[PDB]
Ligand binder design. Structure first.
Ligand SMILES: CCCCC[C@H](O)/C=C/[C@@H]1[C@@H](C/C=C\CCCC(=O)O)[C@H]2CO[C@@H]1C2
Lengths: 224, 342, 57, 231, 310
């Protein structure tokens, strides 16, 4: 090396030092993909917790990087995200089948075979009113809802109508039934019953991500 | 009535073109190149490994001096490498980390990149301040930026996921020409050596040849069964090769206006991400989803060799202007420089 | 009237592509074979150079 | 704009101490290595010290090693030179010089205006001290080195500078052939091995001055005696 | 080092059987190689890089394999050729080499076992603390210091603190169970490092189990997915909590009590009681299996490894 080459190498090693500083921030920040429909209300949930609309929030000294977008080609970019936050609106029965087909594409995607999905069934307060009114019948859209019975393992909140619980868990079962169709434990769906004005939505992502991270470690130690 | 009649005329025109292509298909490239000797086994070793990217590498581009190259990763870092020494010459922090393409200007004074932010950012490498700064942000595409290539220091061509390609005036920041006609997301483009034409491949499984100055589509090439992900001009400018998700590479001829040869193998069932030619054009290098890069004999459609040095998808590759080496980028965050030995 | 306007443009485009001059595939194949042959010696990847002339030793 | 202002110079007693400061504005100071170069009255240039970007590498000339200390303050963009045991041999104009090193960079591209201090090895040879010239005529300047400046990587580390009367030196040619930014194309550098030539086609009034050839093959950086052009 | 030994003909096949310490080497080497072949296959894939578990695991398998190969050849050879130890090697070089290789390979599995427990503890109790990349170049630093700490303890008898003497039946050298100042200083130091390493593995692997069961008993976790991976981890941790403690604690306690016995267990002439000589031999063979079961409990007992073998 000449006198200038050694100085050039010194420049190169200072760049590597700056890349190392940015590496530590990169791993300590979790990347979350936010998917849904126009009426899903995902834009409200991210705003309450605070092209690509990125929002960064920190919970319990853990940094979360959530990319809100709103696709077979640009979905390859989000191949190493910790979790995919899929949000649907359970109130609209007409578009639930569209969401179910949309969810099937995400879950069975070739590049999303190892990404857990933190499914959100948004607007549960609105869903209860629709079932309570009784003007719209789910059996019109889903004939199998007539032969559906609430499992004994269900844990409805106090002051909740049993009719709502039967309808609420049927919507969840349709999404969960898609999750158990395939995957063989590579990825796990984490359904939740959230609403727009819910202040606990940040922790539901936090606890689920901890389980997602924990299940990644246990696969390393078990040599899966 | 009128709409039904017009769409019937389009089918008649398509049959007219198909008959015209069949008329000039007197022979096959396979029959023509049967007599020539094979290239043998192509053995390339990893001379250099460029480490420092902390995420998937999505694009790389050599400078015209055949020594410096720029690579883009989704850790939000554009890095320019001295390939001879593996020294990092620059580290450009990107405003948007979702970069999908990068280009090195032929003059060497500028680099460009852009991704899901729908912006092509031009970076000035030669400033009196000693740092790389953004010189232009080219806004106007309504979809993600998939590819970009400089014609000179003032002109750049970008293809987007909004089904259109654009030619930009960098000084004024406005797109002088817009190239429309693709019905799917345009995934790649390649400039002709004289920079008068460029081909683009989209997800409608079609490749269109565009005239830069005139601004219209000259020819449309079909034959793929899935999305085209990669495209590269032949070194003489009279042909180009494409790569699709159907695990096939096709060699199209501009003047014959049809496919000449298909590069596929029964073992290969994965999509192709990047394609390039050697300096003489005898070798067609393609990157694959199965973590490997297969070097093909362009004339005989034989797999000449395999570059197996990555633990994840081969996302990009490129051959130097002097033909001395080929770089391969991968989702495992490494770049490798390959060439053979006597 | 969006579909009818698009139909006219698509038909008009196919007219331009159908009026180009096309050479035989054998003629086109020969040019591709000729270019590879002429530049075979100056292709380092096809014919590796001696280690003294290889910048990536 | 890029600026380099030196301060702290002045008349000092022999054996005393003085602190020179170089404030940088208009460029990324922390990315550039910095040199101090001095010029004794009616004499040529003499390199004093070097501190790299990031302060990892520091070099001194033998005539000043142990007495001078060079340091930088990156947050304040200030370059320092702590001097001790000052001798009458240290009476010179001290220049602050920036130099960045990467593939294709142009080191020594900008010099400061300099500060005056008054106190109460490859050999570069420029045998021709002065050359009588006329405007519009081509002039050639020759430089010689005791060692071959051509390195095994292909670079020839020879720098050509121009110091117009009353002005700081300006970079003309870096690595023996490349033309510095902002320099007219009439200047051309040609050389081989140990013999180098600077050709100036169509000489003008501004080109009048002293020309120095410097080697950057190894430390300490050494300057030629200098060739003066006069009308 | 030429301790006088008189092995009775009755004990030549009852307690000091030549095959007693010969079958352990055959089984021990086979298990480590079998558990290293599968480890090599997983390493070649490179699909496990977010945790440094494979780095510690690779070191543990290599340490156990070498410990059962270096000491294995010495013991087997002495039972067939050159039975005498005071005549084949009159100089006290082989015994010092034997003494260093016994302590180094008798403490590295304990220290590595206490290191993998810390990796499992941080990767379970606080998943967010562990980064998503192992940085194996810096993972070997912990493995390297473990060997450095173990080898440092093994050179104290060579530096005047403790000594190595031939033990019963006369085919292996180990730290002398005397009452001298060096013997007490070195006898307890070996036990304290060994006792803490087993104590640290047990303490950490109990909190790790106390965390998985807390998750397993979780109402949401029970219905969130089929929790079968956490079950396999409890079994793996409980295997470590049993194999490590049962195999090593009797040996460490035996050394601690023997050195502190009043009157000393070793006569001033330099002869141990015959009852104590056989007890140390038996406890050593108990601790031998820990190097034979580490390739099993850590690797081969995995349901995801048994499937690959078939
Ligand atoms: C502090 C304990 C260190 C033990 C490390 C190592 O794990 C020992 C392994 C055993 C060694 C036992 C050594 C001596 C006893 C031999 C008794 C006999 O002669 O029959 C060799 C016979 O089995 C295997 C190899």
């Amino acid at each position: 090396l000449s006198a200038e080459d050694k100085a050039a190498v010194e420049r190169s090693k200072m760049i590597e030092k700056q890349l190392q500083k940015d590496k530590q921030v990169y791993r300590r920040t979790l990347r979350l993909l936010l998917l849904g429909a126009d009426n899903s209300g995902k834009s409200t949930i991210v705003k309450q917790m605070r092209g690509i609309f990125e929002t960064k929030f920190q919970v319990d000294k853990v940094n979360f990087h959530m990319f809100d977008v709103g696709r077979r080609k640009w979905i390859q970019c989000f191949n190493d995200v910790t979790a995919i936050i899929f949000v649907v609106d359970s109130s609209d029965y007409n578009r639930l089948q569209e969401a179910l087909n949309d969810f099937k594409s995400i879950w069975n995607n070739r590049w999303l075979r190892t990404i857990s999905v933190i499914l959100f069934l948004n607007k549960q307060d609105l869903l209860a009113e629709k079932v309570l009114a009784g003007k719209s019948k789910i059996e019109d859209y889903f004939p199998e809802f007539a032969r559906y019975t609430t499992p004994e393992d269900a844990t409805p909140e106090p002051g909740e109508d049993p009719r709502v619980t039967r309808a609420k868990y049927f919507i969840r079962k349709e999404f969960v039934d898609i999750s158990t169709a395939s995957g063989d434990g590579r990825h796990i769906c984490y359904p939740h019953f959230t609403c727009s004005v819910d202040t606990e939505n940040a922790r539901r992502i936090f606890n689920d991500c901890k389980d997602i991270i924990l299940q990644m470690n246990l696969r390393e130690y078990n040599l899966v | 009535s009128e709409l039904d009649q017009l769409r019937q005329e389009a089918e008649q025109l398509k049959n007219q073109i198909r008959d015209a292509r069949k008329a000039c298909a007197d022979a096959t490239l396979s029959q023509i190149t049967n007599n020539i000797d094979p290239v043998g086994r192509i053995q390339m070793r990893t001379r250099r490994t460029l480490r420092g990217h902390l995420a998937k590498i999505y694009a790389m581009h050599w400078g015209t001096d055949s020594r410096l190259l720029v690579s883009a990763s989704q850790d939000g870092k554009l890095i320019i490498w001295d390939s001879y020494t593996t020294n990092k010459v620059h580290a450009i922090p990107l405003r948007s980390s979702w970069v999908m393409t990068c280009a090195y200007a032929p003059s060497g004074n500028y680099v460009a990149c852009g991704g899901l932010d729908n912006i092509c950012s031009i970076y000035n490498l030669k400033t009196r301040e000693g740092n790389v700064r953004v010189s232009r942000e080219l806004a106007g595409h309504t979809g993600y930026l998939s590819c970009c290539r400089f014609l000179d220091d003032n002109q750049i061509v970008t293809s987007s996921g909004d089904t259109t390609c654009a030619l930009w005036d960098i000084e004024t920041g406005q797109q002088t020409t817009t190239f429309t006609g693709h019905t799917g997301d345009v995934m790649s483009l390649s400039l002709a050596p004289d920079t008068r034409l460029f081909v683009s491949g989209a997800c409608d499984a079609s490749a269109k040849l565009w005239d830069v100055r005139e601004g219209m589509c000259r020819q449309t090439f079909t034959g793929h069964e899935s999305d085209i992900n990669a495209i590269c001009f032949f070194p003489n400018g009279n042909a180009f090769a494409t790569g699709s998700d159907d695990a096939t590479c096709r060699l199209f001829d501009l003047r014959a206006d049809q496919e000449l040869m298909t590069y596929s193998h029964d073992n290969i069932i994965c999509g192709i991400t990047s394609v390039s030619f050697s300096k003489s054009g005898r070798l067609l290098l393609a990157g694959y989803d199965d973590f490997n890069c297969n070097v093909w004999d362009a004339l005989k459609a034989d797999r000449a060799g395999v570059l197996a040095g990555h633990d994840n998808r081969v996302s990009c590759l490129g051959v130097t202007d002097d033909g001395m080496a080929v770089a391969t980028g991968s989702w495992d965050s490494f770049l490798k420089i390959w060439n053979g030995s006597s | 009237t969006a579909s009818i306007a698009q139909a006219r443009k698509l038909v008009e485009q196919l007219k331009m592509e159908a009026n180009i001059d096309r050479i035989k595939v054998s003629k086109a194949a020969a040019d591709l074979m000729a270019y590879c042959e002429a530049h075979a010696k100056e292709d380092p990847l096809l014919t590796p150079v001696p280690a003294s002339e290889n910048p990536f030793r | 704009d890029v600026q380099l202002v030196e301060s702290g110079g002045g008349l000092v007693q022999p054996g005393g101490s003085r602190k020179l400061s170089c404030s940088a504005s208009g460029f990324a100071f922390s990315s550039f290595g910095m040199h101090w170069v001095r010029q004794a009255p009616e004499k040529g240039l003499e390199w004093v010290a070097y501190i790299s970007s990031g302060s990892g590498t520091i070099y001194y000339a033998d005539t000043v090693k142990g007495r001078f200390t060079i340091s930088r303050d990156d947050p304040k963009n200030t370059l320092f030179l702590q001097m001790t045991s000052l001798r009458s041999e240290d009476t010179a104009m001290y220049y602050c010089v920036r130099s960045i090193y990467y593939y294709g960079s142009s080191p020594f591209d900008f010099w400061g205006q300099g500060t005056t201090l008054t106190v109460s090895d490859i050999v570069m040879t420029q045998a021709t001290s002065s050359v009588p010239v006329t405007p519009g005529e081509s002039v050639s300047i020759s430089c010689r080195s005791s060692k071959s400046l051509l390195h095994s990587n292909g670079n020839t580390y020879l720098y050509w500078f121009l110091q117009r009367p009353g002005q700081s030196p300006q970079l003309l040619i870096y690595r023996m052939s490349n033309l510095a930014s902002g320099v007219p194309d009439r200047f051309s550098g040609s050389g081989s091995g140990t013999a180098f030539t600077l050709t100036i086609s169509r000489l003008e009034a501004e080109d009048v001055g002293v020309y120095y050839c410097m080697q950057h093959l190894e430390y300490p950086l050494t300057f030629g005696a200098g060739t003066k052009l006069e009308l | 080092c030429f301790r006088p030994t008189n092995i009775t003909l009755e004990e030549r096949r009852l307690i000091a059987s030549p095959w007693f310490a010969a079958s352990f080497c055959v089984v021990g080497l086979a298990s480590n190689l079998l558990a290293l072949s599968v480890l090599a296959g997983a390493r070649q894939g490179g699909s496990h890089t977010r945790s440094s578990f494979l780095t510690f695991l690779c070191g543990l398998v290599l340490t156990d394999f070498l410990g059962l190969l270096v000491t294995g050849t010495i013991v087997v050879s002495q039972h067939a050729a050159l039975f005498e130890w005071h005549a084949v090697d009159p100089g006290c070089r082989l015994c010092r080499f034997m003494g260093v290789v016994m302590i180094f390979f008798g403490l590295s599995p304990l220290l590595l076992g206490a290191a993998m427990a810390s990796e499992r503890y941080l990767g379970i109790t606080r998943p967010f603390s562990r980064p998503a990349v192992a940085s194996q170049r810096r993972a070997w630093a912990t493995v390297g210091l473990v060997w450095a700490a173990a080898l440092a303890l093994g050179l104290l008898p060579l530096l005047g603190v403790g000594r190595y003497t031939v033990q019963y039946p006369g085919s292996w050298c180990f730290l002398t169970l005397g009452a001298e100042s060096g013997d007490v200083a070195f006898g307890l130091l070996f036990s304290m490092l060994g006792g803490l390493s087993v104590g640290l593995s047990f303490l950490l692997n109990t909190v790790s189990v106390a965390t998985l069961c807390h998750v397993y008993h979780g109402q949401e976790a029970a219905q969130q997915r089929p929790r079968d991976s956490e079950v396999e981890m409890m079994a793996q941790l409980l295997g470590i909590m049993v194999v490590a403690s049962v195999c090593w604690l009797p040996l460490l306690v035996f050394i601690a009590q023997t050195v502190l016995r009043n009157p000393p267990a070793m006569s001033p002439a330099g002869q141990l009681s015959r009852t104590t000589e056989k007890e140390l031999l038996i406890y050593l063979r108990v601790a031998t299996w820990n190097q034979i079961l580490d390739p099993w409990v850590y690797i081969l007992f995995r349901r995801a490894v048994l499937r690959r073998l078939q």
